[PDB]
Design an enzyme around this catalytic site. Structure first.
Site, PDB file in Angstrom:
ATOM      1  CB  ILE A  20      -0.966  -0.020   1.183  1.00 10.15           C
ATOM      2  CG1 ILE A  20      -2.004  -1.153   1.006  1.00 10.15           C
ATOM      3  CG2 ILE A  20      -1.642   1.320   1.289  1.00 10.15           C
ATOM      4  CD1 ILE A  20      -2.798  -1.499   2.253  1.00 10.15           C
ATOM      5  CG  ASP A  66      13.216  -0.980  13.097  1.00  7.82           C
ATOM      6  OD1 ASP A  66      11.964  -0.964  13.052  1.00  7.82           O
ATOM      7  OD2 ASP A  66      13.853  -1.786  13.796  1.00  7.82           O
ATOM      8  CG  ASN A  93       1.816   1.990   4.330  1.00  4.67           C
ATOM      9  OD1 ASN A  93       0.713   1.569   3.987  1.00  4.67           O
ATOM     10  ND2 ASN A  93       2.958   1.346   4.050  1.00  4.67           N
ATOM     11  NE  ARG A 126       8.168  12.643  19.536  1.00  7.73           N
ATOM     12  CZ  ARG A 126       9.155  12.158  20.285  1.00  7.73           C
ATOM     13  NH1 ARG A 126       9.029  12.076  21.594  1.00  7.73           N
ATOM     14  NH2 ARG A 126      10.278  11.749  19.699  1.00  7.73           N
ATOM     15  CB  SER A 143      -7.156  -2.474  10.108  1.00  5.30           C
ATOM     16  OG  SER A 143      -7.739  -3.688   9.706  1.00  5.30           O
ATOM     17  CE1 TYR A 157      -2.682  -5.280  11.344  1.00  4.18           C
ATOM     18  CE2 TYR A 157      -5.064  -5.501  11.084  1.00  4.18           C
ATOM     19  CZ  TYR A 157      -3.843  -5.000  10.638  1.00  4.18           C
ATOM     20  OH  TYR A 157      -3.810  -4.224   9.487  1.00  4.18           O
ATOM     21  CE  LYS A 161      -2.382  -1.294  11.813  1.00  2.00           C
ATOM     22  NZ  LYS A 161      -2.840  -1.135  10.393  1.00  2.00           N
ATOM     23  CB  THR A 192      -0.379  -5.970  -0.165  1.00  2.00           C
ATOM     24  OG1 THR A 192      -0.792  -6.471   1.113  1.00  2.00           O
ATOM     25  CG2 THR A 192      -1.185  -4.682  -0.491  1.00  2.00           C
ATOM     26  CE1 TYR A 202      -8.802 -10.332   8.356  1.00  2.83           C
ATOM     27  CE2 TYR A 202      -6.841 -11.293   7.367  1.00  2.83           C
ATOM     28  CZ  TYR A 202      -7.439 -10.317   8.152  1.00  2.83           C
ATOM     29  OH  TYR A 202      -6.707  -9.305   8.755  1.00  2.83           O
TER      30      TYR A 202
HETATM   31  N1  LIG Z   1      -3.189  -5.286   2.823  1.00  5.21           N
HETATM   32  C1  LIG Z   1      -4.301  -5.369   3.564  1.00  5.21           C
HETATM   33  O1  LIG Z   1      -5.345  -6.157   3.176  1.00  5.21           O
HETATM   34  C2  LIG Z   1      -4.470  -4.392   4.756  1.00  5.21           C
HETATM   35  C3  LIG Z   1      -5.742  -4.219   5.317  1.00  5.21           C
HETATM   36  C4  LIG Z   1      -5.947  -3.325   6.363  1.00  5.21           C
HETATM   37  C5  LIG Z   1      -4.884  -2.596   6.872  1.00  5.21           C
HETATM   38  N2  LIG Z   1      -3.624  -2.733   6.323  1.00  5.21           N
HETATM   39  C6  LIG Z   1      -2.494  -1.941   6.876  1.00  5.21           C
HETATM   40  O2  LIG Z   1      -1.910  -1.322   5.719  1.00  5.21           O
HETATM   41  C7  LIG Z   1      -0.504  -1.051   6.031  1.00  5.21           C
HETATM   42  C8  LIG Z   1       0.393  -1.654   4.949  1.00  5.21           C
HETATM   43  O3  LIG Z   1      -0.004  -3.017   4.686  1.00  5.21           O
HETATM   44  P1  LIG Z   1       0.428  -3.731   3.368  1.00  5.21           P
HETATM   45  O4  LIG Z   1      -0.705  -4.501   2.856  1.00  5.21           O
HETATM   46  O5  LIG Z   1       1.173  -2.839   2.434  1.00  5.21           O
HETATM   47  O6  LIG Z   1       1.464  -4.790   4.102  1.00  5.21           O
HETATM   48  P2  LIG Z   1       2.795  -5.433   3.501  1.00  5.21           P
HETATM   49  O7  LIG Z   1       2.663  -5.725   2.066  1.00  5.21           O
HETATM   50  O8  LIG Z   1       3.229  -6.487   4.445  1.00  5.21           O
HETATM   51  O9  LIG Z   1       3.813  -4.200   3.643  1.00  5.21           O
HETATM   52  C9  LIG Z   1       4.282  -3.785   4.893  1.00  5.21           C
HETATM   53  C10 LIG Z   1       5.078  -2.482   4.786  1.00  5.21           C
HETATM   54  O10 LIG Z   1       5.456  -2.171   6.145  1.00  5.21           O
HETATM   55  C11 LIG Z   1       6.890  -1.949   6.180  1.00  5.21           C
HETATM   56  N3  LIG Z   1       7.564  -2.332   7.462  1.00  5.21           N
HETATM   57  C12 LIG Z   1       7.576  -3.526   8.070  1.00  5.21           C
HETATM   58  N4  LIG Z   1       8.317  -3.428   9.165  1.00  5.21           N
HETATM   59  C13 LIG Z   1       8.781  -2.193   9.285  1.00  5.21           C
HETATM   60  C14 LIG Z   1       9.578  -1.535  10.217  1.00  5.21           C
HETATM   61  N5  LIG Z   1      10.074  -2.168  11.266  1.00  5.21           N
HETATM   62  N6  LIG Z   1       9.870  -0.242  10.023  1.00  5.21           N
HETATM   63  C15 LIG Z   1       9.389   0.388   8.956  1.00  5.21           C
HETATM   64  N7  LIG Z   1       8.616  -0.192   8.038  1.00  5.21           N
HETATM   65  C16 LIG Z   1       8.303  -1.491   8.189  1.00  5.21           C
HETATM   66  C17 LIG Z   1       7.432  -2.852   5.095  1.00  5.21           C
HETATM   67  O11 LIG Z   1       8.642  -2.326   4.657  1.00  5.21           O
HETATM   68  P3  LIG Z   1       9.950  -3.226   4.524  1.00  5.21           P
HETATM   69  O12 LIG Z   1       9.592  -4.377   3.595  1.00  5.21           O
HETATM   70  O13 LIG Z   1      11.090  -2.436   4.009  1.00  5.21           O
HETATM   71  O14 LIG Z   1      10.220  -3.794   5.967  1.00  5.21           O
HETATM   72  C18 LIG Z   1       6.385  -2.644   3.994  1.00  5.21           C
HETATM   73  O15 LIG Z   1       6.656  -1.429   3.277  1.00  5.21           O
HETATM   74  C19 LIG Z   1      -0.203  -1.743   7.355  1.00  5.21           C
HETATM   75  O16 LIG Z   1      -0.295  -0.742   8.379  1.00  5.21           O
HETATM   76  C20 LIG Z   1      -1.341  -2.741   7.489  1.00  5.21           C
HETATM   77  O17 LIG Z   1      -1.634  -3.002   8.894  1.00  5.21           O
HETATM   78  C21 LIG Z   1      -3.410  -3.635   5.261  1.00  5.21           C
HETATM   79  O1  LIG Z   2      -4.726  -9.620   4.710  1.00  3.06           O
HETATM   80  C1  LIG Z   2      -5.952  -9.432   4.800  1.00  3.06           C
HETATM   81  C2  LIG Z   2      -6.855 -10.304   4.178  1.00  3.06           C
HETATM   82  O2  LIG Z   2      -6.343 -11.321   3.459  1.00  3.06           O
HETATM   83  C3  LIG Z   2      -8.235 -10.094   4.265  1.00  3.06           C
HETATM   84  C4  LIG Z   2      -9.234 -10.947   3.729  1.00  3.06           C
HETATM   85  C5  LIG Z   2      -8.958 -12.067   2.939  1.00  3.06           C
HETATM   86  C6  LIG Z   2      -9.978 -12.910   2.469  1.00  3.06           C
HETATM   87  C7  LIG Z   2     -11.303 -12.637   2.790  1.00  3.06           C
HETATM   88  C8  LIG Z   2     -11.591 -11.530   3.573  1.00  3.06           C
HETATM   89  C9  LIG Z   2     -10.577 -10.705   4.060  1.00  3.06           C
HETATM   90  O3  LIG Z   2      -8.694  -9.047   4.992  1.00  3.06           O
HETATM   91  C10 LIG Z   2      -7.848  -8.221   5.630  1.00  3.06           C
HETATM   92  C11 LIG Z   2      -8.420  -7.193   6.375  1.00  3.06           C
HETATM   93  C12 LIG Z   2      -7.587  -6.316   7.063  1.00  3.06           C
HETATM   94  O4  LIG Z   2      -8.129  -5.296   7.790  1.00  3.06           O
HETATM   95  C13 LIG Z   2      -6.194  -6.469   6.996  1.00  3.06           C
HETATM   96  C14 LIG Z   2      -5.621  -7.511   6.248  1.00  3.06           C
HETATM   97  C15 LIG Z   2      -6.466  -8.381   5.553  1.00  3.06           C
END
Ligand SMILES: NC(=O)c1ccc[n+]([C@@H]2O[C@H](COP(=O)([O-])OP(=O)(O)OC[C@H]3O[C@@H](n4cnc5c(N)ncnc54)[C@H](OP(=O)(O)O)[C@@H]3O)[C@@H](O)[C@H]2O)c1
Ligand SMILES: O=c1c(O)c(-c2ccccc2)oc2cc(O)ccc12
Ligand SMILES: NC(=O)c1ccc[n+]([C@@H]2O[C@H](COP(=O)([O-])OP(=O)(O)OC[C@H]3O[C@@H](n4cnc5c(N)ncnc54)[C@H](OP(=O)(O)O)[C@@H]3O)[C@@H](O)[C@H]2O)c1
Lengths: 260, 260
Positions: A20, A66, A93, A126, A143, A157, A161, A192, A202
């Protein structure tokens, strides 16, 4: 000066080497912002995002930090400002997902998740407040699971959030003295690396469906019958950080294509 | 017909030497429960609560445990069960308040608040789930500030309790396999030692009034024109932990006398 554009602005996105964050970074660049692409591990991916932002005609730099380490957050923002001169937009993010029944959540897993998702985002905010120019923008990431969507074995989790949701509402009150707005986006399932890593949790019996089937079931959770993509989140962040998003302040926008 | 009694039950309340926790502990005893009165520092006050519970015709014991230390939580629950034979009800009440503009919040202050309000309550819930008898009850403590009330310079605390709100909703899903309900109470301004910390921030221009005036103004925030008291919260916890409260599960009840 086109409406919704960010020409002359400087944005920072945490965890923007992939997922994202990567979409958000490229999009802010597309809108004309110069972009600081933060990563923690994905060095090559962060370089690719930087290259892409330069290719579409803006400027960008990758900076490792980090986000679990507060002194590294401070340094990230200091390096951001040292490079581009100022900072207008901060998008927090970075995050990790976790599953486990309450009974087996360990201290170490609690700290792994909260240190990044909650503590980290708090101090990103901050530092953002301290470094941002008047009229700036802060966006944190929550989330749909914090409030709108209840998944068994997802308490850690979901809570991580839920804290962020509360933060942004009160942050907007404090940040108003620099006319900075603060909001959060709360995506649902967005395709992602994280999505594919955990989609089986899920879904009931998620393990006995293929990864493609699981994605398709997430698609049918929306009445639009498609998955969320990183660009969907990026579209909304771009509006929130524009001049036109100003009156959205202190809010959490759930982005799940109508699943909730 | 007498509603809502707890005869034969055993309850544990964290931070029940004083404040809301004291009123909850005494009340659960009044309803017929045997009570484990946990404290961290207020030894004499915990002895007073124990005495009061014995005066009402029940039994109680005071046990010291620092709820920031997860091993001390485990021990607390082990000692509770070793003493009374079983445990039916766990009320997680221990908490600290904090104020400060986002710009000035330090790491240490983040950890001081979250380690007790969020991390501590999370592991109190975990240990409660492990130690409770089938059909038991867990109640955590949140705050009206997490969702319903927005106070400048209160982001850390508001977020600490927002995490709890999310926790209880998902905890109820996990805890259902032992038919244990999990809820939280979210008090508004309730007259205790903590009220004196908060009162100048929860009242508009609170800083230009006497402590007595502030309490009066807090009273006028409710349409009932009175303050919240610990007994108000105790009355609601007592119902939630009774047989009759069963269908309230996974919920956060804001207790502010209609201020929100
Ligand atoms: N994808 C979903 O369905 C979903 C749904 C709801 C909420 N979210 C939220 O959306 C945000 C991004 O999710 P995503 O789907 O992009 O996950 P992702 O594909 O796992 O990507 C995670 C990102 O977080 C970074 N990260 C991990 N550890 C870190 C650290 N110690 N310091 C700084 N950066 C770090 C990673 O960077 P590096 O690889 O360089 O470590 C990467 O850029 C998260 O806050 C997640 O909780 C995602
Ligand atoms: O990784 C996720 C995911 O697979 C799914 C998902 C995957 C399959 C069916 C429904 C949900 O939902 C998320 C929701 C979030 O707030 C954060 C991460 C996920
Ligand atoms: N009062 C309010 O207006 C209000 C409003 C909203 C929410 N709340 C929540 O209500 C709960 C009760 O607060 P209160 O008003 O009763 O506050 P209070 O008078 O400050 O009482 C604090 C309680 O927490 C206990 N405690 C503190 N540190 C502890 C630790 N390390 N381990 C175990 N126990 C510890 C204290 O016990 P010791 O003295 O032994 O340390 C005391 O029992 C808290 O969770 C608070 O966040 C209160």
């Amino acid at each position: 000066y086109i409406p919704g554009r960010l020409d002359g602005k400087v944005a920072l996105v945490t965890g923007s080497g992939r997922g994202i964050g990567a979409a958000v970074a490229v999009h802010l660049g597309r809108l004309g912002a110069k972009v600081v692409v933060n990563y923690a591990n994905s060095t090559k991916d962060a370089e690719k995002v930087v290259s892409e932002i330069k290719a579409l005609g803006s400027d960008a730099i990758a900076i490792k930090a980090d986000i679990r380490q507060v002194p590294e957050i401070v340094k990230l923002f200091d390096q951001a400002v040292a490079h581009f001169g100022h900072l207008d937009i901060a998008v927090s993010n970075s995050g990790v997902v976790s599953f486990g029944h309450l009974k087996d959540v360990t201290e170490e897993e609690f700290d792994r998740v909260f240190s990044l998702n909650t503590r980290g985002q708090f101090f990103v905010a901050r530092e953002a407040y301290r470094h941002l120019t008047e009229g700036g923008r802060i966006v944190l990431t929550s989330s749909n699971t914090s409030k709108d969507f209840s998944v068994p074995k997802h308490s850690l989790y979901s809570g991580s959030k839920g804290a962020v949701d509360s933060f942004v509402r009160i942050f907007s009150k404090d940040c108003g003295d620099k006319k900075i707005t603060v909001n959060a986006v709360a995506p649902g399932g967005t395709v992602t690396d994280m999505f594919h890593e955990v989609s089986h949790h899920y879904i009931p019996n998620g393990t006995s469906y293929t990864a493609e089937q699981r994605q398709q079931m997430a698609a049918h959770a929306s009445p639009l019958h498609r998955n969320g993509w990183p660009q969907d989140v990026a579209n909304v962040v771009g509006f929130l950080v524009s001049k036109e998003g100003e009156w959205v302040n202190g809010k959490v926008l759930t982005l799940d294509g109508g699943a909730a």
